[PDB]
Design a protein around this ligand. Sequence first.
Ligand SMILES: CCCCCCCCCC(=O)O
Ligand SMILES: CCCCCCCCCC(=O)O
Ligand SMILES: CCCCCCCCCC(=O)O
Lengths: 53, 556
Amino acid sequence: TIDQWLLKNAKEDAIAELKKAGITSDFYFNAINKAKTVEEVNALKNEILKAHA
Amino acid sequence: SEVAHRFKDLGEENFKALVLIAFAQYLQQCPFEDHVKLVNEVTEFAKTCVADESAENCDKSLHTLFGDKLCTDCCAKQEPERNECFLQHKDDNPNLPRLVRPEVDVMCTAFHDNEETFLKKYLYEIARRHPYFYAPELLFFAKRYKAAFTECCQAADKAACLLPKLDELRDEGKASSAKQRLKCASLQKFGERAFKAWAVARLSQRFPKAEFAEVSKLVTDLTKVHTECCHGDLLECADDRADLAKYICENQDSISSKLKECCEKPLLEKSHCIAEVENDEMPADLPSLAADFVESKDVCKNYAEAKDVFLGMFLYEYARRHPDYSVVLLLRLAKTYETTLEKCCAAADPHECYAKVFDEFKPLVEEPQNLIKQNCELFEQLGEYKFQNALLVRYTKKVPQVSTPTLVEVSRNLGKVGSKCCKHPEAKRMPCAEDYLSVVLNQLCVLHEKTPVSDRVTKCCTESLVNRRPCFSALEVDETYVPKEFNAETFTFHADICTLSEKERQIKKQTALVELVKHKPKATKEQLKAVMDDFAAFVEKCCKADDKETCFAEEG
Ligand SMILES: CCCCCCCCCC(=O)O
Ligand SMILES: CCCCCCCCCC(=O)O
Ligand SMILES: CCCCCCCCCC(=O)O
């Protein structure tokens, strides 16, 4: 196994996605980084995207 | 494929059981033999839909399937909408009697005569008397129901065994259903955002070691489960529940340490267990919220970029540190923060403007603390019954336009808070109390809404979900209410009170008490206590008479 590699990879990337949408603050990137589970990276990333528009 | 999908995911029995629940809740005024028929005949259809996927109509869109099977103004109606017709006509307090279980022998006989049909009937019955009952918990209660007959029905004293089991089952259901009713109300009257907020507060209290991101996961998926469930999509609801328990039981490491035992259980018991689990211990050393939420040079920049998440994290951080606050209180704090940021991030010097937010929270905390404390002192001195009696007067004097049945039902329920919560240490009281109150006030709101008679109640039910309890408690007596004229009949009692349970008998006494307050809203207090004592006495007198029981006439 290694979901850690995916975990690492989802965090890097969500962050790029958010950056592309014009989110600019480590407050949010830090939170992605605290994640611990890919599913949560995803949901957190989507909630931010919804919240920003 | 969709109806295969679900059958495949749920299993025959669960699939079977839920669709029967589905119909019951859609179609409340239709018999058991109808309902059962169309469950098998969608179930025959499903079984085929699995084996070859692509049969003529396995294509069809789930509503469409159930919508077509019911008909045999809403069956005339066209789609993405005909479905909405159903959940509309879904109504609260049905136009149906009390169950009043027939007899322990009568039942066990029926139970043996058909284990299955019997159990299939329990579902039907509860399903139809509460059309927002949370389907997957219903299955759980069914297994508890089946277990109770599968234990007592062989015994010499079936009665001393079965009843106590069943009664705690009835009570467990009523609690569960109201609880669900509030989730549906939140969603359907105040929207997804509110529910999500509620879910962030509860889950953060309950999973305080979880990171926010995992809490977003739980909330987003929890919110689907209830969206769908409250919206009648009971399979997709039930399966998404299963999925979320799946996800939760795999990442225990990173949600809570209190789940291993829950997560060592059969599906039906698993979610239920998880749903009820002790809050986890919060992490040992948590920085104050000051840094992120008041001191940071970037509060407003962060807030502008994604308001709902910003407030979300706020709510998460507060809640995880405050297992002792009720959920609604928490939401009021978030609301307070929010309206401060909406005011202050407009200002020339936002920082100055919100430096003191945390000070605003104190009176907001104090207020429920003080209240519960008073009501518990009162409960302590009165006992359950007289405490309910005290509330009846209070509430009836507040909103006398509300119907009598409603006032009795709601006030008895408010009174049961005290037995529920005053017991605990003043430190677990608030979540216990304020959150149970919410649920009771909700019941009041939803009942009231079908026949709005009081603007004061409507207003409190509508302005704000989270302030309902404060709003209702802020009501003074309605000094403009015109007392209805007297009916020496509603204040007589008849011989059949004698043969009723104390509780039913209580419900009569309280019914009369309410009626009296409506008639003489001014004269009150000791009088009213003294009225109940007399009631609860010429009953327990007239019934001891063995003097043609006409005696009741002879107190009229
Ligand atoms: C008042 C707070 C608003 C909360 C609604 C948004 C929370 C969804 C969960 C999340 O933030 O990922
Ligand atoms: C309450 C959160 C527990 C999550 C377990 C999944 C089903 C819960 C029903 C509910 O949460 O309202
Ligand atoms: C900031 C959290 C507030 C709860 C979310 C829903 C807010 C509007 C409805 C209400 O509270 O009456």
